[PDB]
Amino acid sequence: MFNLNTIYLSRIFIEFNFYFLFFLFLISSIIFYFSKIISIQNLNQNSVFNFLKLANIFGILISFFIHIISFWFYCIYSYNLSLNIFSDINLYNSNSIELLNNSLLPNYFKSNITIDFFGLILLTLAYIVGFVSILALDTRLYWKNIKYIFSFTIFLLIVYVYVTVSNILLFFMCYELLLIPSFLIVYFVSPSRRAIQASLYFVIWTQLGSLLVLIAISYIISITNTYEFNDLKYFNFTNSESTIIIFLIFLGFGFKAPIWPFHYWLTKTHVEAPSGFSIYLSGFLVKTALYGFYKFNTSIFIDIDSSIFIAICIMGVVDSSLKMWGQTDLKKLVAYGTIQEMNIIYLAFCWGDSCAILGGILFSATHAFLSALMFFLVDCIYRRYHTRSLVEVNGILHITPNLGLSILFMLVFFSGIPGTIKFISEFYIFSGLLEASPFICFILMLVANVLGLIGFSKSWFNATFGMPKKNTKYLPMDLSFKESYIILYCFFFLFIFSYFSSIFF
Amino acid sequence: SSGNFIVLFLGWELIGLTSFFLINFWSTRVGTLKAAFKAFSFNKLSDLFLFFAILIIFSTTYNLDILSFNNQIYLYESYNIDMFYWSINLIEIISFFFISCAFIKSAQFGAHIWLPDSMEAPVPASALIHSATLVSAGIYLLLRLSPLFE
Amino acid sequence: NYHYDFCGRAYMGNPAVQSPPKEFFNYHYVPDNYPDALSGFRIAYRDPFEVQHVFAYENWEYQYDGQWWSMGSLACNVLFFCTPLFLYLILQVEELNSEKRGGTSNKFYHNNAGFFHFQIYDNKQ
Amino acid sequence: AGNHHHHAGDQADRVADKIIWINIQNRIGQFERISAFEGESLLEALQRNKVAGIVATCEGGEDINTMLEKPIDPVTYGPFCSSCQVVVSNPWRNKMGNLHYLEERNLVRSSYPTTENSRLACCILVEKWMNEMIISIPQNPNSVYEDNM
Amino acid sequence: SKAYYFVKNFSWAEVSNLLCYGTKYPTVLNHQQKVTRLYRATLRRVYAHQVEGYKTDFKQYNENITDIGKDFNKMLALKPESLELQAYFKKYEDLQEELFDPAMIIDESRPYAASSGRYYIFDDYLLKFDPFGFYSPKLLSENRPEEAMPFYEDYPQNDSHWNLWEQFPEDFEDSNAEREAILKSNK
Amino acid sequence: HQFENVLLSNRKNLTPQESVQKVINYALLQDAKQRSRTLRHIKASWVIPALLFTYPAWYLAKGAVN
Amino acid sequence: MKLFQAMWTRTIYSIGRMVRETGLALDRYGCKLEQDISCYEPLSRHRNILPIYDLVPTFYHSTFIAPNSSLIGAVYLGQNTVVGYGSTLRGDNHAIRVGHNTVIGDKVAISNVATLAAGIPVSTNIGNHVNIGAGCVLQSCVVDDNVTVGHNTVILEGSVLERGSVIAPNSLVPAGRLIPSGQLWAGSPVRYVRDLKEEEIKLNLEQTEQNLSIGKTHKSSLIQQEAYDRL
Amino acid sequence: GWDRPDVPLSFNPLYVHKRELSIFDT
Amino acid sequence: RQNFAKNITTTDIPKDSHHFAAKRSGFTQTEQAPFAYNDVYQYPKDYKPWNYNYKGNGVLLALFLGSAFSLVAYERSYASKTGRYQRKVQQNYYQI
Ligand SMILES: CCCCCCCCCCCCCCCCCC(=O)OC[C@H](COP(=O)([O-])OCC(O)COP(=O)([O-])OC[C@@H](COC(=O)CCCCCCCCCCCCCCCCC)OC(=O)CCCCCCCCCCCCCCCCC)OC(=O)CCCCCCCCCCCCCCCCC
Ligand SMILES: CCCCCCCCCCCCCCCCCC(=O)OC[C@H](COP(=O)([O-])OCC(O)COP(=O)([O-])OC[C@@H](COC(=O)CCCCCCCCCCCCCCCCC)OC(=O)CCCCCCCCCCCCCCCCC)OC(=O)CCCCCCCCCCCCCCCCC
Ligand SMILES: CCCCCCCCCCCCCCCCCC(=O)OC[C@H](COP(=O)([O-])OCC(O)COP(=O)([O-])OC[C@@H](COC(=O)CCCCCCCCCCCCCCCCC)OC(=O)CCCCCCCCCCCCCCCCC)OC(=O)CCCCCCCCCCCCCCCCC
Ligand SMILES: CCCCCCCCCCCCCCCCCC(=O)OC[C@H](COP(=O)([O-])OCC[N+](C)(C)C)OC(=O)CCCCCCCCCCCCCCCCC
Ligand SMILES: CCCCCCCCCCCCCCCCCC(=O)OC[C@H](COP(=O)([O-])OCC[N+](C)(C)C)OC(=O)CCCCCCCCCCCCCCCCC
Ligand SMILES: CCCCCCCCCCCCCCCCCC(=O)OC[C@H](COP(=O)([O-])OCC[N+](C)(C)C)OC(=O)CCCCCCCCCCCCCCCCC
Ligand SMILES: Nc1ncnc2c1ncn2[C@@H]1O[C@H](COP(=O)(O)OP(=O)(O)O)[C@@H](O)[C@H]1O
Ligand code: FES
């Protein structure tokens, strides 16, 4: 019963949501530039900053709704396309349906849009995490950094082109564009003075991996003059070229997606970055690397043993889990948790295009939401209690019961209770790893889910419980409606996404 | 009253978490938190063992139903699992993990260290946990999966 | 057993009472930073010992070359250093079982001829 | 606030009782006497009083992780030149103590002759005990073309 | 006494010093303080083991306390720098070690005891605190200005900047009536 | 009905408290009107550049990347 | 629509500004070509009445405004209000309203704060027969009718003076405080002095009337001497 | 019988740090 | 800091002007001047700060209408899948 109307509606929605975002950004930027001689806030109720905040927030939100609709259309379209290809067995019949483009808006960068489930999951993560982070950064943007209210819109446009393109070069360029806005945010919006050095560490560490990926892309392009991302089927790389490409790709994308030993920059940046931008970084900016690694390694044929890469990922997991205990800083502890989860996700991609990719994608989504939740809780603690250190913070539950309850439920979700996409992703990865290498699976599970979990829980429980006798004149009140509903939405997603259609998982 | 291993694992984690809360009822005191954290660590170890056993069962038989597993385990009794450097009997390894988690939750010798410290809870909570609720989880596991351990 | 007098090489804070530190690393903010004013903008005076602990680890550093091996326990340090090698060797030994049996092996399988998961493959007129 | 002993209704203290006196031997062999305050660098005091013989090409160095912080941050870049050297008399030089490694590097790299008592004004932070401190200020070298401007 | 013997990683020597004398450094104590504290500790332990114990014998308790009292009277009479006094101190410290009981009863009136901190008592600062006007009336003028200070609004509890431009009723009349009237009068 | 300038009106008959209260209320109302007018002018300054320069900017971007 | 009207007003204002810019630039270029130095001359740019866009001072022609003074933004003067020499009514952030027969002394400065708490107007409002001495400072204060403020007096935000109150010179009214009617207050922090008498009230009324007459004479003399623009 | 004063704030005694919190005891 | 305007015109702020009264006679030579504004916030009676105080049926109606639309949409979808204009209810339904 599938008809061409659904196909064209899917394509039109995907194409036009990008232009909706772009036109919103363009209008907002034109207003901002041409309303004032100097593009800084006027400290009065009639400033354009209020309009810009409104436009950014409710462009992201409306584009997120349209993205939900377009993602559902894509799911139907992909399912029915697979059915059309698979169903017919007659040799004379073949599915050759050709679509003509609309005459209203042009194709951005003269590229035909191609959408995949992983790309749309990444785009949904971008939308939601960007919404949370923009909601967080309101107190940070003041009177000279208001120009960074558009950072998340720029991120959304970059990610949209990144996930809706079938061109290798455009793919790589979109991946590399993410550096400038993130560096500028960390440099100009971070309150702490150590953020200045943290930004440089972030730039250099990420750029080393960017150069590695650039070398790999140069190898692919120079050898294969193609750029369509599908002509690689008709060209085979020799053993030496293939091993060089996989090594470069893995190391370069692991610089971004933190792997052992390349997580020093991540720890520094998470500790010294804005509490609202740490959410976006951990939640989304480390998963574009995973998506790019998946695309490249599934496109290239590799005839090498992945034991070395699996060992690197497992070593990162073990290192982060063991170090969890020794952190009294909640933000650094959450950063180590992010490193652990990202290393597990990266390990999920070490078997080419096997079924491990499904667990990897689900784990990427759950880690995004869980890291957003954890960093937002740390943000609330730091903002109301003027410290994010375990020695200075104690007995949160008895003065701010809602915040303590949020911490406890965050710990329960992090533990991986059944009924959560966290548990589902752990089940996928461990079920595969048990047959792949059962002893390695046992070691990984033991370390991560006992030693790292206990180290993680020690600090959070100590902060939540106790007796806050110190500085009774300065104790805060409670979570606000904004914070409470953000926490509730994170919990709601982590719980209900387990009912998403199992066809794609 | 769990129909499959997933519900069993859910109930396992839930009793662990709620026992932790009952032990840590006196949240103001950090001395109580130490006993609560001891119980929490042992419960997490038991959860690890139970999760690994369930994963082994799922890998062997593509099913998590309790009745199906009980009526199928005899067929796979003869099987072995190739681990790091040893060929362990499948039934033996699965029963080893189950018995380990059961001992931890039933407070057998060695793993009983948390039970004396769990008495920090109020007497009603202590009675409920120590009579038939927390300390009988291992007994329930053995009774429910008896065909495996036979 | 751990006591400050007899620990020797397992360092820890001394039990003897000490005077508060006169100078210690402190929170510093970017120039012209916008203050955080949540819940009435009430700031309490920070405890010197607590602030010192907050910023001590970040600034801690090794005094002489090779101190890392000796600090703590040499055996545990060597085991931690060799952990990646142990993991790789365990993976290879496990993969021997996969090779001899016929199960999943550590390789980049290429069942799909570059066809991404549930990708839209279409042509235009 | 803080670091003061005033109660409600008290009169302010005189600046005369708070100024710290620095005695200098100029590059031309004459004697000078200037006033400084605690919390500001000797370089700032000397430039405020317009003492000759100091070029200060870098003008105090970096504005973050400065050498003036009592616990010097290890990520500090140190002084960016050696054009503010001053010779301090032994009674106060010993109290100042051993040199930072970056400061010593710059001092030894100085193109003009140096003394064991030499120190950088930007690296010196004024303290109460420095009252009546005697220093000498020979001429410092000129680094680049912009110094003449 | 803080009753923190089994917490804070005390060594056996430190715990023994805490039990025998209230301090962890008995050297700081003088002769009278040492003797009196040791006598009190010995009597407390003897009472714990031979009065509030298992099938306690009160006659034996009386005899034991009498002997201890005579010995401690002799100890107090003895000079501080005497090997006999040192032997007495060692004897009674050994007795304290012998009677040391893990999980010994700790009175609920002492710090670090079971039930010591079960409740958090709220201070008058928290009791007064009421930023909104439901319980404690809130002035429309947020604060009362003090002399020698400007009149500034108090910082709100919630400082979210997600605020729209000022909203006005639909069809709100906002013509500059004052200027219009003055211009009309001027002509 | 008809505009009345309370500040320039005669308030000698009323008590001083009533007089000051009327002046305060009149000032608040006039300030609200002025606030509305200035906000409207700011909104117009926002709208004009958007209408004038949105299409030229889209034209420039479209020509650049297509 | 009001928004469209505002947009049209802004557009025409910008066009006029651009026309002025090009005209003045052309005149300067013509001077350069003609070897004429007239454009170069530096002359005071001070404007007695300066209007912020949409905020134009309004005053009855009967008022005397000193040419040395400066009215800016939303300022509103009454029938015979007198503004002294050198006094500035900035009134740019909010409005400044003055009564029919008030007198503002020389060097008086009036400027209102950005914002205040709820229920407190952020504009300066002055009664009908107020007499403010030279050198006074006022900020977002309400003054009722028949109020005399001594010279060198500071009145801060949210301060309300009722009818007939008198403040001695060289005194400050703390922000957010009330000066009841018919009372004399003095001191740097104002302190109660006494209740005014009928003789003192009559003297103050005569003083303000004399000041109004002196303002009228000043206006006539300045118009005679061409120092006052015949508005 | 006796009218007891309200429960003492002393019941929870504020703890004042007198020793450095060593990073080796984190 | 906050720069919004307190005096809104959408509605009049609830207030009580009798709780605090300003002294206007009997002053001394050492007493400070009284305060001009003495109005306090007055909450509506029966307002409970510990819950949402929500008395509208909009959310419930929206959720119920969404559920009803979902039900009817599923009915139509099942009919379309079975290739019928409407569901063909069977005479007996068993457990499954
Ligand atoms: C303070 C919060 C702090 C949070 C931050 C901290 C977070 C971490 C710590 C957490 C712990 C601390 C916080 C807890 C203490 C809060 C204290 C407090 O605020 O007290 C006031 C608070 C509010 O009460 P109130 O202030 O007195 O009055 C509020 C108004 O009067 C009510 O006005 P009304 O009467 O008009 O009601 C409006 C509306 C309430 O409106 C909403 O909440 C909007 C919801 C929009 C959708 C969002 C996703 C919802 C996902 C499911 C969860 C539903 C919400 C219930 C809460 C979560 C679960 C506990 O009510 C409904 O109609 C309920 C129906 C909702 C169903 C919507 C389903 C959408 C689709 C979901 C996916 C598909 C499902 C398929 C199911 C198939 C059949 C099984 O106290 C409560 O009443 C608590 C209610 C708790 C939930 C139970 C009641 C609802 C049950 C709904 C149906 C499910 C039950 C079984 C149904 C079986 C048949 C299907
Ligand atoms: C390659 C062939 C393998 C197959 C053959 C069979 C296996 C042979 C393995 C070799 C065994 C004999 C050699 C070990 C000597 C001890 C280690 C050493 O030399 O470091 C310097 C040694 C250790 O210095 P340190 O660790 O800085 O001292 C810390 C302080 O004591 C302060 O300590 P604390 O109070 O703070 O407490 C911390 C304590 C306790 O720490 C803890 O509680 C945390 C856990 C620590 C690890 C405990 C072992 C866990 C299992 C390890 C499995 C490794 C698997 C990966 C490697 C596989 C290699 C095939 O940390 C220690 O364990 C330190 C003691 C020394 C390490 C003992 C554990 C590791 C030994 C190597 C095991 C290798 C097994 C291979 C087979 C595995 C199955 C296939 O320094 C001393 O000599 C001081 C005395 C230390 C106690 C010695 C006790 C007697 C040991 C035997 C003496 C006679 C040896 C004759 C050799 C003849 C030629 C071959
Ligand atoms: C282990 C972790 C556990 C964590 C959780 C622990 C437990 C936490 C408990 C505490 C927190 C949750 C429970 C309490 C939540 C608050 C409930 C409440 O009452 O708050 C009051 C709260 C505050 O009250 P307020 O300040 O007055 O604000 C009012 C609202 O702004 C707006 O109020 P309003 O009265 O203005 O109503 C507005 C309404 C307006 O409502 C209406 O308009 C309905 C009535 C008109 C129907 C149409 C008639 C058309 C013809 C005209 C007929 C004549 C006129 C009829 C109407 C007359 C007037 C009634 O508009 C809408 O709702 C728009 C929705 C539209 C899209 C969805 C529905 C449509 C679907 C498609 C329908 C297709 C078929 C229909 C086609 C129609 C033709 C095209 O208001 C609300 O309830 C608003 C809803 C959202 C509240 C927050 C929900 C949070 C949910 C958190 C869930 C967390 C789940 C975690 C699960 C974890 C599992 C592991
Ligand atoms: C060649 C064509 C070029 C087209 C250029 C487009 C020009 C856009 C100019 C924007 C001006 C914004 C201010 C308008 C005046 C607001 C007056 C006011 O507040 O009174 C309340 C009134 C009405 O309020 P109300 O109380 O009736 O609330 C209902 C609101 N509506 C009518 C929308 C359902 O005005 C508004 O509320 C309008 C709000 C406008 C700002 C919206 C911000 C969200 C993001 C969209 C911004 C525009 C970008 C383009 C669209 C998105 C991308 C497709
Ligand atoms: C981890 C190091 C620290 C972090 C920085 C990362 C730097 C290293 C990044 C990975 C580089 C690739 C290493 C694995 C190569 C595997 C293939 C191989 O060489 O085997 C012999 C290969 C494979 O041979 P084969 O035996 O498999 O098959 C071919 C055999 N013949 C030819 C005989 C028929 O043989 C070769 O052809 C030699 C190729 C050597 C290439 C080495 C230089 C690569 C230069 C490009 C990358 C430079 C990145 C620098 C980044 C900045 C560093 C500061
Ligand atoms: C607490 C319990 C702990 C349990 C033990 C945990 C692990 C202990 C260490 C296991 C070591 C296993 C070594 C053999 C596997 C070699 C894999 C390989 O091919 O690598 C070649 C590698 C290179 O591999 P490669 O990847 O280049 O191979 C080419 C790719 N394939 C194979 C796919 C074609 O070469 C090496 O560098 C190996 C160096 C070995 C150095 C000596 C190691 C001695 C270890 C002795 C351990 C003690 C005895 C056993 C104890 C247990 C008995 C039950
Ligand atoms: N930061 C700390 N580092 C090392 N030991 C500590 C520390 N804090 C407490 N201790 C231990 O606590 C005990 C003292 O407890 P405390 O609460 O300070 O009461 P008091 O000092 O009056 O005896 C000592 O054994 C001491 O060694
Ligand atoms: S100013 Fe350059 S080193 Fe001092």
**Contact criterion met (CB below 8 Å) for A285 and A178:** yes
| Residues G118, E140: C-beta atoms closer than 8 Å | yes
User: What's the gap in Å between I63 CA and the centre of ligand 3?
Assistant: 7
Greatest Cα pair distance, chain D, in angstroms, is 56
| Residues A45, I80: C-beta atoms closer than 8 Å | no
| Residues G54, F41: C-beta atoms closer than 8 Å | yes
Chain B residues with CB under 8 Å of a chain E CB are 26, 28-29, 31, 120
| Residues A469, E164: C-beta atoms closer than 8 Å | no
Please give the Cα distance from G76 to G85 (Å, whole number). 18
Q: Please indicate if any CB of chain A lies within 8 Å of the CB of C84.
A: yes
Nearest Cα of chain A lies from the Cα of C49 at a distance, in angstroms, of 10
Q: Closest residue of B to C86, CA-based?
A: B84
Amino acid (one-letter) located at A209: G
Of F8, F16, F30, the CB nearest to G78: F8
Residue C40 is given by DSSP the state G
Coil, strand or helix at D73:
coil
Query: Whose alpha carbon is nearest atom 6 of ligand 5?
Result: A251
Please give the Cα distance from G143 to G165 (Å, whole number). 9
E4 is an annotated ligand-binding site residue: yes
Q: Distance of CA H14 to CAs A204, A467, B21, Å?
A: 46, 10, 26
User: What's the gap in Å between A486 CA and the centre of ligand 1?
Assistant: 15
Query: Whose alpha carbon is nearest atom 27 of ligand 6?
Result: A305
| Residues D71, C31: C-beta atoms closer than 8 Å | no
Of C2, C3, C37, the CB nearest to E155: C37
Q: Which ligand is nearest to the CA of A250?
A: 5
* Chains in touch with D (≥3 Cβ pairs < 8 A): A, C
Helices (H), A228-385: 239-256, 264-272, 275-280, 287-299, 307-323, 330-347, 356-384
Residues with CB under 6 A from ligand 7: C 13, 15; E 8, 10; H 18-19, 21
Coil, strand or helix at G154:
strand
**Contact criterion met (CB below 8 Å) for A501 and A75:** yes
Contact present, A and H (at least 3 Cβ pairs less than 8 Å): yes
Calculate helix-pair angle for A48-87, A151-163, nearest 10 degrees: 10
Mind giving me the DSSP string for H1-21?
A: ---PPSPPGGGSPPP---S--
Contact present, G and C (at least 3 Cβ pairs less than 8 Å): no
DSSP β-ladder status, G109-110 and G137-138: parallel
| Residues G99, F30: C-beta atoms closer than 8 Å | no
Q: Provide the token pair at B45.
A: 């170890």
Kindly list the residues from chain E whose CB atom is less than 8 angstroms away from the CB atom of residue A477: 131, 157
Please give the Cα distance from E43 to E37 (Å, whole number). 10
| Residues E179, G58: C-beta atoms closer than 8 Å | yes
Burial (Cβ within 10 Å: 0-12, 13-18, ≥19) of residue B25: middle
Please give the Cα distance from B24 to B114 (Å, whole number). 13
Q: Please indicate if any CB of chain H lies within 8 Å of the CB of C116.
A: no
Please give the Cα distance from E8 to E3 (Å, whole number). 11
Q: Provide the token pair at A422.
A: 């966290």
DSSP β-ladder status, G131-132 and G148-149: parallel
Q: Closest residue of E to H7, CA-based?
A: E121
Kindly list the residues from chain A whose CB atom is less than 8 angstroms away from the CB atom of residue F50: 27, 30-31
| Residues G76, E151: C-beta atoms closer than 8 Å | no
The phi, psi pair for D144, rounded to 5°, reads -125, 180
Residue A69: HSE in the Cβ half-sphere, 13 Å Cα cutoff: 15
Tell me the CA end-to-end span of chain F in Å, nearest whole number: 60
Amino acid (one-letter) located at A256: K
**Contact criterion met (CB below 8 Å) for G154 and G172:** yes
**Contact criterion met (CB below 8 Å) for G190 and G154:** no
List the beta bridge partners of residue G154: G137, G172
* Chains in touch with A (≥3 Cβ pairs < 8 A): B, C, D, E, F, G, H, I
* Chain A stretch 40-69, residues whose beta carbon is closer than 8 A to a beta carbon of chain G: 43-45
DSSP β-ladder status, G142-143 and G160-161: parallel
**Contact criterion met (CB below 8 Å) for G162 and G144:** yes
Residues with CB under 6 A from ligand 4: A 20, 23-24, 27, 54-55, 58-59; F 43, 46-47, 50-51, 54-55
Count of residues for chain B? 150
User: What's the gap in Å between C16 CA and the centre of ligand 5?
Assistant: 57
**Neighbouring C-beta atoms of residue C74, cutoff 10 Å:** 11
Q: Which atom belonging to ligand 1 lies closest to the Cα atom of I58?
A: 36
E138 is an annotated ligand-binding site residue: no
Helices (H), chain B: 5-23, 30-60, 66-76, 90-106, 114-117, 123-128, 137-144, 146-149
Q: Find where tokens 């923009």 sit.
A: A134
Q: Compute CA A374 distance to the chain's CA centroid, rounded to the nearest angstrom.
A: 14
Q: Please indicate if any CB of chain C lies within 8 Å of the CB of D10.
A: no
**Neighbouring C-beta atoms of residue E148, cutoff 10 Å:** 9
* Chain A stretch 41-60, residues whose beta carbon is closer than 8 A to a beta carbon of chain I: 43-45, 47
Among A125, A46, A32, A12, smallest CA distance to A367 is for A125
User: What's the gap in Å between A66 CA and the centre of ligand 6?
Assistant: 53
Q: Which atom belonging to ligand 6 lies closest to the Cα atom of A305?
A: 33
Residue from C74, C78, C89 whose mutation best tests the ligand 2 pocket (most atoms within 8 A of CB): C74
Q: Please indicate if any CB of chain H lies within 8 Å of the CB of C31.
A: no
**Contact criterion met (CB below 8 Å) for E165 and G190:** no
* Chain E stretch 41-60, residues whose beta carbon is closer than 8 A to a beta carbon of chain C: none
**Neighbouring C-beta atoms of residue B50, cutoff 10 Å:** 24
**Contact criterion met (CB below 8 Å) for E118 and B29:** yes
Spell out a b/e string for E4-16, using b for 16 or more CB atoms within 10 Å of the CB, else e.
Answer: ebeeeebbeebbb
The phi, psi pair for D53, rounded to 5°, reads 100, 0
**Contact criterion met (CB below 8 Å) for G72 and G57:** yes
Q: Compute CA D58 distance to the chain's CA centroid, rounded to the nearest angstrom.
A: 14
Q: Distance of CA C67 to CAs A326, B70, C12, C71, C74, Å?
A: 20, 57, 17, 6, 10
Burial (Cβ within 10 Å: 0-12, 13-18, ≥19) of residue A99: middle
Among G50, G76, G86, G79, smallest CA distance to G63 is for G79
The phi, psi pair for G110, rounded to 5°, reads -125, 125
| Residues B28, E112: C-beta atoms closer than 8 Å | no
Coil, strand or helix at A432:
helix
Of F3, F5, F39, the CB nearest to E166: F39
Mind giving me the DSSP string for D110-143?
A: -SS---TTEEETTT-B--GGGTTEEEE-PPPPP-
**Neighbouring C-beta atoms of residue G64, cutoff 10 Å:** 23
| Residues F36, E178: C-beta atoms closer than 8 Å | no
Q: Please indicate if any CB of chain C lies within 8 Å of the CB of D14.
A: no
| Residues C31, D70: C-beta atoms closer than 8 Å | no
**Contact criterion met (CB below 8 Å) for A118 and A361:** yes
DSSP β-ladder status, G148-149 and G166-167: parallel
Residues with CB under 6 A from ligand 2: C 10, 73-76, 79, 86
* Chain H stretch 5-24, residues whose beta carbon is closer than 8 A to a beta carbon of chain A: 12-15, 21
User: What's the gap in Å between B109 CA and the centre of ligand 2?
Assistant: 27
Of I2, I27, I36, the CB nearest to G192: I27
The helix (run of H) or strand (run of E) holding residue G183 is strand G183-186
The phi, psi pair for D31, rounded to 5°, reads -115, 140
